[PDB]
From a paper:
We crystallized native MAB21L1 in space group C2 with unit cell constants a = 167.7 Å, b = 177.6 Å, c = 115.6 Å, β = 126.5°. The native crystals contained 5 molecules in the asymmetric unit and diffracted to a limiting resolution of 3.05 Å. The pentamer interface is composed of hydrophobic and some polar interactions between the N-terminal helix α1 of one monomer and the C-terminal helices α11 and α12 of the neighboring molecule. A citrate molecule from the crystallization condition stabilizes this interface. However, we were not able to identify by structural or mass spectrometric methods the nature of this low molecular weight ligand, which may be a buffer component or have co-purified with the protein from E. coli. The fact that the structure of MAB21L1 without any nucleotides added shows density for an unidentified molecule in the ligand binding pocket may support the suggestion that this positively-charged site acts as a binding site for an acidic ligand. Although the equivalent region of MAB21L1 is ordered in our crystal structure, it notably does not adopt the α-helical NB-loop conformation.
Here, we provide the first crystal structure of a MAB21 protein and the structure of MAB21L1 bound to CTP. The human MAB21L1 structure exhibits a high degree of structural conservation with cGAS but features a number of differences.
Residue numbers in the entry: 0 to 54, 64 to 87, 89 to 99, 102 to 141, 145 to 174, 180 to 215, 228 to 359
Write the structure that this text describes.
Amino acid sequence: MDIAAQAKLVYHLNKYYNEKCQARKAAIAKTIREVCKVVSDVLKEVEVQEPRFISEGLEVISPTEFEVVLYLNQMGVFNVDDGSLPGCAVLSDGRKRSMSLWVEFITASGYLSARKIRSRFQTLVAQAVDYRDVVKMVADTSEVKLRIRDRYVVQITPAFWPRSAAHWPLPHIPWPGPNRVAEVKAEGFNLLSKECDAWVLQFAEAENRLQMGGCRKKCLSILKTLRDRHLELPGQPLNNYHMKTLVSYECEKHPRESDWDESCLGDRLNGILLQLISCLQCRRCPHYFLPNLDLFQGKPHSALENAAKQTWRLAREILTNPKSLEKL
């Protein structure tokens, strides 16, 4: 009897993925196509004032929030991760300051300033917005953020293998195979100009590729969707990034690709919600690549607890009656 309920769960989850998850990616695509015209148009204007800025590398934060990473024409004339500041990193010799496309922006100390490029970029964006009612500029934040049609918020973050991520993959876990490891590692990493004077690290390119195989993406698509529909809560305790970062952890716990067959979608999804409820209750949720930073950092105890209540309540309605997914 325990066999048939596993299959019923996998069936209704596939319906959720095809009915509700696809609808998400459809509404998001409508919202992104509307948003992306505004940004690329504005970015075209920034290109005429500053040609170094140019118009793929997108990030969905929520259905209404996005982060555009703008990959700048670089020279990489500058060569550095230390325990100094967690999750964030920062030239070689006192020569070749004139080698950078952004040569003016290297500091007197000889370091290259994220704070200064983002300000220069922010001044340009706030100026380009002056269009009437459809675009707004977000202030009191160091990062560039636009408010479009008073409905959506888009952050535009200037952007281009690390010391903390060096352990991964630990040869302990058969996953990933040497083929998947070197393949995902070739993606490299990205540095995002955000506050913490440092650059934020992001592996959205490696993370999303690491989860290739099996139902991992269907699981993420289902997790992101459930979060949108039922876990947008006071305190914004839960992000698409929380789900994304958990799916990777569950990949380790179940190393074998067989654990990720389509038959196992219910198990892996159920396993992930539970680990999430633990993270909420334990009050700690670590980054996949960098354990030193906790993605619950700064979250109120009241909100982390309530999120645990709703996440738990959600998994039970699912298991007791998996058809309940239709009405979710």
